[PDB]
């Protein structure tokens, strides 16, 4: 597929309803995926690996934090994914705690100090 029909498939995945019914949300999605689409900042998977470790330390779970290391190794052992940074950032952002802040914690470089 192309991305433009694929965002519709996402709109049909999470909502049960038809795509001729809900088109306001698909319209709101198309604005935000468009015009901020492709990577424009520097990708680094190691910082995201350490932040998946910091999330699993935030649960105080050290065993899966060591399981994540061999999974993170296996992702590079196969090497059939174009953006390793994206899916780990994505999955880290979508975490849910069964049962902080980030103005002291330093992120990636934006390539706004570097020419595009």
């Amino acid at each position: 597929k192309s991305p433009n029909v694929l965002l519709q498939n996402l709109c049909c995945r999470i909502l049960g309803r038809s795509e001729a019914d809900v088109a306001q949300q698909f319209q709101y999605a198309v604005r935000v995926i468009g015009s901020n689409f492709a990577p424009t900042v520097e990708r680094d998977e190691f910082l995201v690996a350490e932040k998946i470790k910091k999330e699993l330390i935030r649960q105080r779970r050290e065993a899966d934090a060591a399981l994540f290391s061999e999974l993170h190794r296996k992702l590079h052992s196969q090497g059939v994914l174009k953006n390793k940074w994206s899916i780990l950032y994505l999955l880290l952002s979508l975490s849910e705690d069964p049962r902080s802040y980030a103005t002291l914690f330093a992120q990636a470089l934006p390539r706004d100090a570097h020419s595009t």
Partner: protein, 46 residues
Amino acid sequence: IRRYTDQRSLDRSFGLVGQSFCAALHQELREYYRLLSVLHSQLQLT
């Protein structure tokens, strides 16, 4: 701009609103360095 920041950050009685003024002289120095980075990247031409 920078001599004043060099003085006020080593002046230990300048208040906390004069030391907020001097923090508005920190933001526009860090932005200056961002600009200079953009310049240097485009030199790797006159």
